[PDB]
Amino acid sequence: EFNILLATDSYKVTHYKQYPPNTSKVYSYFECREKKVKYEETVFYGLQYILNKYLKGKVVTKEKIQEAKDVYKEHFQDDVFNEKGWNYILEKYDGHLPIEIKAVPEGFVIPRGNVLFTVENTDPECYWLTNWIETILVQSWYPITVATNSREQKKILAKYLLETSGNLDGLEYKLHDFGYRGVSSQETAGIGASAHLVNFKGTDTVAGLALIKKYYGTKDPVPGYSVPAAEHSTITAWGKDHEKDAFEHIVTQFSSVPVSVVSDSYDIYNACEKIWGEDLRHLIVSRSTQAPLIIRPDSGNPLDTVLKVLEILGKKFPVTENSKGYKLLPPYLRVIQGDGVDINTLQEIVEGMKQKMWSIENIAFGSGGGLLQKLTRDLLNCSFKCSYVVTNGLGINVFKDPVADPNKRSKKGRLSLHRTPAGNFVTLEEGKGDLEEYGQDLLHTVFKNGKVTKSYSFDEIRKNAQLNI
């Protein structure tokens, strides 16, 4: 059972005693601060999950106040917990948070250094609450960063797909999520997988399917799809001497559907030349355009291994030249590179495939740790700061401006996001957005006093995150 009173940074428990006396409003905002992947624009995704899972409804109970008071007395070796403040929310509001959250629509692709969401207390007694929930809200850095980095990889794949083949067919099935085991927790898996599924349709991280269904919803049967595939265990269990029988049984069991057969168990080059290219060739050439064999190398240099595999297949199977002049394997034969794949190495493989005249139609990518784990809050400088305060009737525009780091400077006053006359975005500071020079604020109220006031379907998120191309 989750308790919002124990889901903050410990020092925030002490902050109610630190603000200027008679503070009635603490108003804060979140941005991906500005500074070969630059990440100049970000997909805004994941807040709806946090609003629903942690912030809406009766989140304050007498049992939760008692739990927090007893924990923090031991944790601080001092009584410094705001029992009165939390009891006030319980009595006046039936444990519903007197907070208002305004955000940019989910799936929206916004350039760096723009307000993405704002937080403020609706009750003067709860000026301290705005920054209590900073910690839980700042964790939206993760779904944002996964969705942005995955979108950046989609631009790479889309460039090389159109370059080498003239179409963008099956782009949505070119980057497969292999990350379930490589993430820090079961919860991160669902969050991360769901963020990737904003840009792609292929996933092995089953957790992401239920998260979308519960917090976003879709008109579609499933948010994501997978194909039957082998692991080293289902190959090696047959014995070193029976790597052929493993391959033979697997391709026969899944003959009406595409099947990924890991082929590096002992010798990848030997598996492609002797097993697939000769001994089981009659089981390959017969396969459907809707049911191809997907060969999977899983070791060695990703670009080197990819090229050696493809040419072996070029000798043993008929390779056709396409409209652009790029080599194309038969429709029943494809490849998956599911090892050492991140945004950088993905770029190096597709560039190499282009340089050796191979079409990107021939391959798909499998990314785990690089896709959902090897990402930090600093990649996009995801940050939550106080920009405005009301103390004893006087509103003041506040910000930090550290001398040794001007990139750490934050925005001032009440903020708003606007569509510019040239179809771009601008963040207005100091409440200038009230004048509506560039029309209405693009932030909408998504949360107000314990209630989710605006929700997005995963379908409109997907439409919003589409590549301009």
Ligand X SMILES: O=C(Nc1ccc(CN2C(=O)c3ccccc3C2=O)cc1)N1CC(c2cccnc2)C1
Residue 232 marked in a binding site:
yes
Query: Among residues 71 and 452, whose Cβ is nearest to a copy of itself?
Result: 71
Angle between helices 186-196 and 207-215 (to 10 degrees): 70
Q: What distance in Å separates the CA atoms of residue 407 and residue 41, rounded to the nearest whole number?
A: 17
The neighbour count for residue 255, using CB atoms within 10 Å, is 14
Name every residue whose Cβ is closer than 8 Å to that of residue 329 and which is 6 or more positions away in sequence.
310, 313, 314, 317, 319, 335, 362
Q: Is 229 in the site for ligand X (CB under 6 A)?
A: yes
Q: Which of residues 336-375 bind a copy of itself (CB under 8 A)?
A: 368-369, 373-374
Residue 297 marked in a binding site:
yes
Q: Is 272 in the site for a copy of itself (CB under 8 A)?
A: no
Q: Which two tokens stand for residue 268?
A: 């990848």
Give least dist CB 412 to a copy of itself, A: 10
Give least dist CB 88 to a copy of itself, A: 20
Q: Which residue has the tokens 């191979």?
A: 358
Residue 193 burial by Cβ neighbours in a 10 Å radius (0-12, 13-18, 19+): buried
| Residues 42/148, Cβ–Cβ less than 8 Å | yes
Torsion of Cα atoms, 157 then 163 then 166 then 172, to 10°: 0
Q: Which two tokens stand for residue 23?
A: 């503070």
Q: What distance in Å separates the CA atoms of residue 369 and residue 382, rounded to the nearest whole number?
A: 20
Q: Is 23 in the site for a copy of itself (CB under 8 A)?
A: yes
What's the longest Cα–Cα distance across the chain?
84
Q: What distance in Å separates the CA atoms of residue 307 and residue 304, rounded to the nearest whole number?
A: 5
Between vectors from CA 202 to CA 145 and to CA 467, what angle results, nearest 5°? 55
Q: Is 9 in the site for ligand X (CB under 6 A)?
A: yes
Q: Which of residues 46-105 bind a copy of itself (CB under 8 A)?
A: 54, 71, 74-78, 80
Give least dist CB 181 to ligand X, A: 6
Which of 31, 106, 134, 441: binder of a copy of itself (CB under 8 A)?
A: 134
Q: What distance in Å separates the CA atoms of residue 131 and residue 389, rounded to the nearest whole number?
A: 12
Q: Which of residues 171-200 bind ligand X (CB under 6 A)?
A: 173, 176, 178
Q: Is 175 in the site for a copy of itself (CB under 8 A)?
A: no
Q: Is 260 in the site for ligand X (CB under 6 A)?
A: yes
* Binding partner selected for residue 173 from a copy of itself, ligand X, none, CB under the kind-specific 5 to 8 Å limit: ligand X
Residue 405 marked in a binding site:
no
* Binding partner selected for residue 292 from ligand X, a copy of itself, none, CB under the kind-specific 5 to 8 Å limit: ligand X
Q: Is 283 in the site for a copy of itself (CB under 8 A)?
A: no
Which of 95, 190, 340, 368: binder of ligand X (CB under 6 A)?
A: 368
* H/E element, 294: strand 293-296
Q: Is 141 in the site for a copy of itself (CB under 8 A)?
A: yes
Q: Which of residues 99-118 bind a copy of itself (CB under 8 A)?
A: none
Q: What mask of x and - would describe binding to a copy of itself in positions 190 to 219, judged by CB under 8 A? A: -xx----------xxxxx-xx---x-----
* Binding partner selected for residue 305 from ligand X, a copy of itself, none, CB under the kind-specific 5 to 8 Å limit: a copy of itself
The stretch among 32-40, 100-108, 258-266, 442-450 that binds a copy of itself (CB under 8 A) is 258-266
Q: What is the DSSP letter of 55?
A: I
Query: Among residues 164 and 367, whose Cβ is nearest to a copy of itself?
Result: 367
Q: What distance in Å separates the CA atoms of residue 306 and residue 192, rounded to the nearest whole number?
A: 27
Q: What mask of x and - would describe binding to ligand X in positions 429 to 448, judged by CB under 6 A? A: --------------------
Give least dist CB 331 to ligand X, A: 8
Give least dist CB 271 to ligand X, A: 15
Q: What distance in Å separates the CA atoms of residue 129 and residue 90, rounded to the nearest whole number?
A: 13
Q: What distance in Å separates the CA atoms of residue 467 and residue 469, rounded to the nearest whole number?
A: 5
Q: Which residue has the tokens 């957005």?
A: 433
Q: Which of residues 383-442 bind a copy of itself (CB under 8 A)?
A: 384-386, 389, 391, 396, 398-405, 408, 410
Q: What distance in Å separates the CA atoms of residue 50 and residue 455, rounded to the nearest whole number?
A: 12
* Binding partner selected for residue 334 from a copy of itself, ligand X, none, CB under the kind-specific 5 to 8 Å limit: ligand X
Task: Give the residue numbers of the binding site for diphosphate.
Answer: 181, 232, 296
Task: Give the residue numbers of the binding site for beta-nicotinamide D-ribonucleotide.
Answer: 204, 296-298, 338-339, 369, 377
Task: Give the residue numbers of the binding site.
Answer: 181, 204, 232, 296-298, 338-339, 369, 377
